[PDB]
Amino acid sequence: AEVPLPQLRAYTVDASWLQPMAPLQIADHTWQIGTEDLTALLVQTPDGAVLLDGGMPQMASHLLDNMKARGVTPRDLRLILLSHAHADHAGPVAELKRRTGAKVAANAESAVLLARGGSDDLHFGDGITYPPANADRIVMDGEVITVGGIVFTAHFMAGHTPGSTAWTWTDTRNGKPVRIAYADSLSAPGYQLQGNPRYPHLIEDYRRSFATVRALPCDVLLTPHPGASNWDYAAGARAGAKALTCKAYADAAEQKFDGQLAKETAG
Template sequence: MRASTTAALLLFAIAAFAQPDPESRSRNQPVEPFRIIGNVFYVGASDIASYLIVSTQGHILIDGGFVETAPMIRANIEKVGCRLTDVKILLNTHAHFDHAGGLAALKQQSGATLMASERDAPLLERGGKNDPQFGNKFLFPPVEPDRLLHDGDRVTLGGSTLTAVMTPGHTPGCTTWTMTVRDKGRDYHVVIVGSPTVPNYKLIGNKMYPNIVNDYRHTFAKLKSLSCDVFLGAHGSYFNMQDKLARKARGDTRNLFIDPNGYRQFVAAAERDFQKELKRQQTAR
C-alpha cells in the first residue's frame, strides 16, 4: 500500500513538472536507440541525450532528460534488449530540468542507486529551485542522490569504469564522464561532455555563484587536457548527432562518433563563446 501511494505521488509530481513549451518539445522528439561503440548505447531523445552502459551484471544510465523524456528512455532501453529494472546505477551530467527532470521517475522505477556531484546535489534535492542562473524558472521533481561524487571519483559496474571529471560553470557541479571502451580489438577513450555553454548566463556580479568565471576557466583547461576518441555530450547537438546519423543512413560505414577533431573544435568554440560573453559583460559594467 505504501509503495503504491509513493508511486501515485510521484506520477502526480511528474505531471505537475511536465514541460510543454515548444523549445523543450523540439529537442525532445523520439528517436530510435542505437549502439554507439562497444557496450555504449544512445537511449535518449532527438537532442536530449541519455546513455546506457550495458553489462551482464547490470547497467549504468547517464541522464534522465526532461520529465517527459523518462518514458522514451525506458522504451529505448527495452528496444535495445535491456530492462529498466536491470539499471543499477544512475548518473547525471548536471542538475538542469532537461537532464535531471526524469531522474526521480527513473530512480523509482528501476530501484537504481543515484550518484551525482556533491556541488549539484543540493540543486537536485531542491528540484531546480534557486538555480544560480534561472532562479525558480525551470523546476523538476526533486531527487536525492545516494552517493556524492568528487573530481576523479570512479564508478564501476560489470567491467566498465566511468570517471567523474568535474567541469563546473554551467552548474556548480557539472560533470563530464570519461571511460575506456573496447571495440573490435581496440581501446577507445570516450568523453561525455557535461556542458561548457553560457546560455544568457550572468558571469559578472553573480552573487549566487561568485566563482563562476574561475570555474569556467578551470573547466576549459580540464576539457582541453582530456584524451578523446569518441565524442559525446549532454546534448546530441554538441557532437552533431543528427548529421552523423543521416550520413550513416546514406551508407557511410565508418563510426562517425569516433571524432577527436570534432571534440577539440567543440571545446575551442565553447571557450571562444565564453570569452566573448565575458568580455561583453565586463565592457557593459
C-alpha cells in the same frame, strides 16, 4: 487595477529535443537512447546497466522502452549518472528511480540541486524546476565507479552548473579500445558572468573547466546537447562523423565565452 499575477509558465523546448529515436549504437556497450536532440547514454554490462542523463521529465517512459528494446529490464538498471542537474538532463531521474532499480551517483553540488528539483537555480531562479530526487552516492573529483567492469571516472568541470561533471570510460569497437568522454555543457546562456553575487568565481571555474575538458581521454566526445559536439543523432551511420574532439569543443566554448564576456562588459 484588475490585473492578476501571471500564470506559471511551463519549461518549453524545441520539438527536436522531445523527438523520440530508436537506440543508436556508439560503441560495443554504449548506446544513445534519448531523443534526437537530448543525449541519454545507456551503457550495458554483464553485471547491469548504467544510464548517463535522462533528458527532459516527460522522457521517462521512452527511455524505459528503449532500455527494454536493448534487453534491459527495470531491475537491470543499476546506476544513473548526470552531466548536470538541470531539467533538460536530469528531468526524469525521480521517476526512473521509482520505476527501476537505479541508484544515483553524483557530486555534492549536483546532489543538492537535484534534491531541490532544480529550484533556486543560481541563474534561472525557479523558472526550470522538475521533480526532485535524492542521490544515493556522493562522488569526489576523479573518483571511479565500476559497473560490470566498465570503469567510469568523474571529472568536475564547474561552470554551467557548480556541479557540472564530465564522465569518461573505455569501451571497445572492432577489438580496439574506445575512450569515450561525455563532457558537460560549457555554455553560459544568459548568465551574469562578472561580479555575480551567487557565483563569485564563475569566470575562474569556467577557465579551469575549459582546460579540464581539453585534456580528457577522448577518442570519442559526446555532449548532453549533441549539437554542441557536432553530433547528429538523426543521421544514422554518420551520426558521429562530424563530431568535435574534446580539444576543439573546449576551444570553441572558450572563444564563445570570451565573446560573451566582452559583450557583457559592453552591455
